[PDB]
Amino acid sequence: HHHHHHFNLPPGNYKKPKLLYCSNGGHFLRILPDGTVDGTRDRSDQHIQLQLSAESVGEVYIKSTETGQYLAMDTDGLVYGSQTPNEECLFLERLEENHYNTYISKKHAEKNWFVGLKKNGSCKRGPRTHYGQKAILFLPLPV
Template sequence: MCKWILTNGASAFSHLPCCCLLLLFLVSSVPVTCHDLGQDMLSPEATNSSSSSSSSFPSSFSSPSSAGRHVRSYNHLQGDVRKRKLYSYNKYFLKIEKNGKVSENCSFSCILEITSVEIGVVAVKSIKSNYYLAMNKKGKVYGSKEFNSDCKLKERIEENGYNTYASLNWKHNGRQMFVALNGRGTTKRGQKTRRKNTSAHFLPMVVMS
């Protein structure tokens, strides 16, 4: 609150009539409200844009303490299903037979469904036998009738354009174990595989519906 205050210089007005002095006194006693000039100088457009921008700011970029914050999610990648034939670098198609045996073959029975179950993790299932490609703790590659932790494989595209499939849960002496077919088309133990070995490299071939 601001007031008009008569200073000692008021004596300079001594020559004025009493009615004028009384009027000056009344005016000086009336309180005057001082407005925030900084706020008044903002245009209506600027004020509206400021309020609208704050209200329309994406909730995903709000501060960590804000309630209801949306965490970035990649769920759209899960459940993606691809029909492929896995063609090995050694020129064999991977097949999962009805008895659970994993071998090589080039027929309808080697068509596989590759499903994303996590980011970078897939499940490989034979359409013909309904068995999943799996690797146990001992590095044995086999076909599993039911989906379990052995069936989770880390899929990675290597520099030569081929894919590798490593067990998500099992390692040997700290090293990853890979699905691989040797020169005769039979599976190799995971302990004997390495990422750089071409026997563990597979080319996913698109199956035309």
């Protein structure tokens, strides 16, 4: 239910799409049509528009409005874009530092694997992410 994690939730809803802005390097979470996932500073990019949806309270899907691909994290902690929703597509959306949004792999929740962007714009691998990093901090902006 709580998945052994705090339950501080961020404000806001899923009514409209959003951009997931990463504090770390100022990148927007990007889901490439090829299943590639990274971050870009280009506000005009057509693959940064994401529609979040709540499966259950605090659990979301992050889907690309452009491609329809779901954000996901594999068994080895690699983030990728899935054509279909599966257990690797669910994330625990939580409030962080009383301000930001963090996304913890539900499948790998016990290991604290988050979605995160490096200063260079490249995704981090599950095991490389951790509480306290700027890489995991996101700001949902209107498109």
